[PDB]
Amino acid sequence: VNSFSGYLKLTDNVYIKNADIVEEAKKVKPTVVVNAANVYLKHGGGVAGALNKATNNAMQVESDDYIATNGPLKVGGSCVLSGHNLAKHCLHVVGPNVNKGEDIQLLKSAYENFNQHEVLLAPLLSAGIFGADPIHSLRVCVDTVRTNVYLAVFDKNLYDKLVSSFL
């Protein structure tokens, strides 16, 4: 038993809710919140900006130190950093950005990072401003992640569409 509330069950291990991931993280304070990162950990917009804004920019300060030491992530890759005021840990995962020309085939590699954590609060990787088809991203999630994933879909209309179209 855990602390997540009002999620629809999609599969044995995947749950979904129409929720702001920031508000969800503040309420639940999960062990792991997933950030929809880029390889530079430049948290300008979307989930990264909203999460970063909610940390008062501490996520970006930590991230710049991480990049200065380690260099950029790989598309499909991840790193674990602090969750600050939102979670124990933040798993920064780089899904391919279709709007930057990145290969959508790397989405499965991105979701494999979630398997290193027993429970995660996560967004829909490569969807929204990443340019991928969110229906596809949910299918790859369900077909790749074996650990317990709580998907927070921000967009109301998109949440309804994902549930109604889910096989």
Q: By CB under 6 A, name the binding residues for ligand 2FX.
A: 36, 46-47, 123-124, 127-130, 153-155, 158
Residue 162 CB, nearest approach to ligand 2FX (Å): 9
Packed helices 134-144 and 156-165: angle between N→C axes, nearest 10 degrees: 60
Closer by beta carbon to ligand 2FX, 61 or else 129:
129
Backbone angles phi, psi at 81, to 5 degrees: -130, -175
Closer by beta carbon to ligand 2FX, 83 or else 123:
123
Look at residues 103, 106, 128, 105 and name the one whose alpha carbon lies nearest to residue 48: 128
* Cα separation, 142 vs 154, whole angstroms: 18
Closer by beta carbon to ligand 2FX, 48 or else 79:
48
Closer by beta carbon to ligand 2FX, 81 or else 137:
137
Residue 93 CB, nearest approach to ligand 2FX (Å): 10
Closer by beta carbon to ligand 2FX, 42 or else 65:
42
Residue 140 CB, nearest approach to ligand 2FX (Å): 13
Residue 164 CB, nearest approach to ligand 2FX (Å): 15
- Rg over CA atoms, the chain: 14
* Cα separation, 42 vs 166, whole angstroms: 32
List, as one string, the DSSP characters of 15-74. EEEE--HHHHHHHH--SEEEEE--TT----SHHHHHHHHHTTTHHHHHHHHHHHHH-PPP
Residue 158 CB, nearest approach to ligand 2FX (Å): 5
Asked if residue 115 lies in contact with residue 143, where contact means CB atoms within 8 angstroms, the answer is no
